């Protein structure tokens, strides 16, 4: 048999408990796969059985819960279950520019935008999903769409105003 283990942090335990139904039902129903929550090791254990076919689903199912570890919603990791070429790419905000303290916080605020609005725009334009961690940025989408959203995000922490990036990212998705 085959088995994968996924570590869950302490801040992700309560959403994992409160959303567990729609975690394990998409894995046991139409993937035919076994899962358990090992509380002692604080891990997600995913194992095959006699009821599974299309073996890559296992690996794909792994990415499913990994996305729900990294802060994505259940529906977007469900998209990782359904679609075939979906990817999650990750980088730190300081990986593009050295930002100290209040400048790093302001950079986060420009990526998020007022009311969240700006980040929603990029998702809604690029058909991606974006999780802003404490410092990390995770982008879930197809490779070209990740390239577009990553360029827009790096432009927001290029120092550019959110308005110019808003208009330009609405313009560039017409190709």
């Amino acid at each position: 048999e085959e088995t994968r283990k996924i570590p869950v942090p302490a801040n992700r335990y309560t959403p994992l408990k409160e959303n567990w139904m729609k975690i394990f039902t998409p894995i046991v129903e139409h993937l035919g796969l076994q899962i358990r929550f090992n509380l002692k090791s604080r891990n997600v254990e995913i194992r095959t059985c006699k009821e599974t076919k299309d073996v890559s689903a296992l690996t794909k199912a792994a990415d499913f819960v990994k996305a729900f570890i990294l802060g994505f919603q259940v529906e977007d990791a469900l998209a990782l279950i359904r679609l075939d070429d979906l990817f999650l790419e990750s980088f730190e905000i300081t990986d593009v520019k050295p930002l100290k303290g209040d400048h790093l916080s302001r950079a986060i605020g420009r990526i998020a935008g007022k009311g969240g609005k700006t980040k929603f725009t990029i998702e809604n334009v690029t058909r991606t999903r974006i999780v802003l961690a404490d410092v990390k940025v995770h982008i879930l989408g197809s490779f070209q769409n990740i390239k577009m959203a990553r360029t827009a995000i790096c432009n927001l922490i290029l120092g550019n105003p959110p308005s110019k990036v808003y208009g330009n990212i609405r313009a560039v998705a017409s190709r």
């Binding site: 529906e75 977007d76 469900l78 998209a79 359904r82 679609l83 979906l86 058909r127 991606t128 999903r129 879930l140 989408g141 197809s142």
Partner: peptide
């Protein structure tokens, strides 16, 4: 969801549109 947006972005809207155009004794 992301899957729904991708599928609905690569498909075509269909259905709703109505055109108003145009015995016994």
């Amino acid at each position: 969801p992301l899957a729904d947006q991708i599928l609905a972005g690569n498909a075509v809207r269909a259905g709703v549109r109505e055109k108003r155009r145009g015995e016994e004794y």
